[PDB]
Design a protein around this ligand. Structure first.
Ligand SMILES: Cc1cn([C@H]2C[C@H](O)[C@@H](COP(=O)(O)O)O2)c(=O)[nH]c1=O
Ligand SMILES: Cc1cn([C@H]2C[C@H](O)[C@@H](COP(=O)(O)O)O2)c(=O)[nH]c1=O
Ligand SMILES: [Mg+2]
Ligand SMILES: [Mg+2]
Ligand SMILES: [Mg+2]
Lengths: 217, 217
């Protein structure tokens, strides 16, 4: 193997891809290769939801968008533009790129971002947000993978919503759905089910983030 | 009403002050003053543990110390230098300072760090760790306050360990004791007990972090 760090990633946004959305919240949870492994393969029917590894770097940030959240977007995320602005949240800017860079630089390399439906939503959107900045992309040099593709490959070797996958493994609803941190913790739990097979698949399929096409722009 | 952000802060370290300890974990949770103000003032005996604000910025980092953790500190924190290093954790260095700076820069000013027993431990230690660096302190221009002093004012207006206060207030044991993030969450919950009274006290008693003397030279 060779990916040293998996960075679990989720985003909330102002709306669907067709509306040309902006990020309103993002979470990164960096776990070393070995901390993932040294969960068990979780035994029980159903198994208990595992505790995260002890050693973890986490970053969760709310981001003011330049356009308004759609009606449904505010209901499920519990974020709004007005509420983000009134609490002094800054836009997706150069300073956020430096924070992101400095955080990534603390992780052993190579690093692979891992996101649920990442190839269709999170990565394309993140690529668009960063392409607005004057600074070089902090995710240049990092890899990425979609956890849905991972889980279809591991499983097969009907709904694939994060919630549905989680409740099938654990027999409990996930908590804090559609919060970036909540959803990252939920995905981490799902990825602790067979972490050794996961890592093997990720080492096979990780692709440069630089080859992610932007959602729009 | 003049502190715009409270940043709840906890550190883990290699041991006690007489040993000349190094930071091995730090967590910062930034909450806009409006989010505290608009927490329900607690009612009941015991009141329910308060819900955290929706809009929060969080940073949690594990840090490789130069010297090993005392056996006692490893036992209570679940961290050791051995494990931090095998998981690729970096030292308390210039890049961590740039990261902290960028994080703080995203918060509306003035900012106030809030830490349980911060005056005798967290703040002097942090000041020592920042003094080793070539790059200027990112905490220059932030304020700070010890939440023990805050609660002593709000209470009287016997044990002041974090656990003792939490369970006196909420009749419940705290979770994830002696993890930086766990301890920050417990401190947030204690500070949401009388949030408006806490904010007024912080505003009156906050002091510049640059006046904090280092723990050791
Ligand atoms: C699932 C879903 C997502 N979205 C948008 C808003 C979310 O912040 C964003 C990211 O999806 P997520 O919350 O599943 O991670 O996509 C909707 O507007 N409506 C929906 O039903
Ligand atoms: C409470 C306690 C802390 N410590 C050290 C290890 C902790 O990481 C550090 C920070 O304290 P804390 O865990 O109370 O926040 O102090 C001891 O060595 N002995 C003790 O009894
Ligand atoms: Mg998502
Ligand atoms: Mg989400
Ligand atoms: Mg502490």
């Amino acid at each position: 193997g060779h990916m040293q760090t998996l960075i679990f990633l989720d985003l909330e946004a102002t709306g669907l891809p067709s509306s040309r959305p902006e990020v309103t919240e993002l979470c990164l949870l960096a776990v070393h290769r070995r901390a993932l492994e040294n969960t068990s393969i979780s035994q029980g029917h159903p198994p208990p939801v595992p505790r995260p590894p002890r050693v973890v770097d986490k970053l969760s940030l709310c981001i003011a968008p330049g356009k308004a959240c759609s009606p449904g977007a505010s209901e499920i995320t519990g974020l709004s533009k007005a509420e983000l602005e009134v609490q002094g949240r800054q836009r997706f800017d150069d300073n956020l790129a430096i924070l992101l860079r400095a955080f990534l630089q603390r992780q052993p390399q190579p690093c692979c971002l891992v996101a649920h439906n990442g190839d269709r939503y999170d990565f394309p959107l993140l690529q668009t947000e960063l392409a607005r900045l004057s600074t070089p992309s902090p995710l240049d040099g990092t890899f990425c993978v979609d956890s849905i593709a991972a889980l279809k490959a591991l499983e097969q070797a009907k709904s694939y919503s994060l919630g549905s996958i989680y409740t099938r493994l654990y027999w409990q609803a996930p908590t804090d759905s559609h919060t970036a941190e909540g959803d990252v913790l939920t995905l981490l739990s799902i990825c602790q089910w067979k972490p050794q097979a996961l890592l093997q698949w990720v080492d096979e399929h990780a692709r440069p983030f630089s080859t992610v096409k932007p959602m729009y722009g």
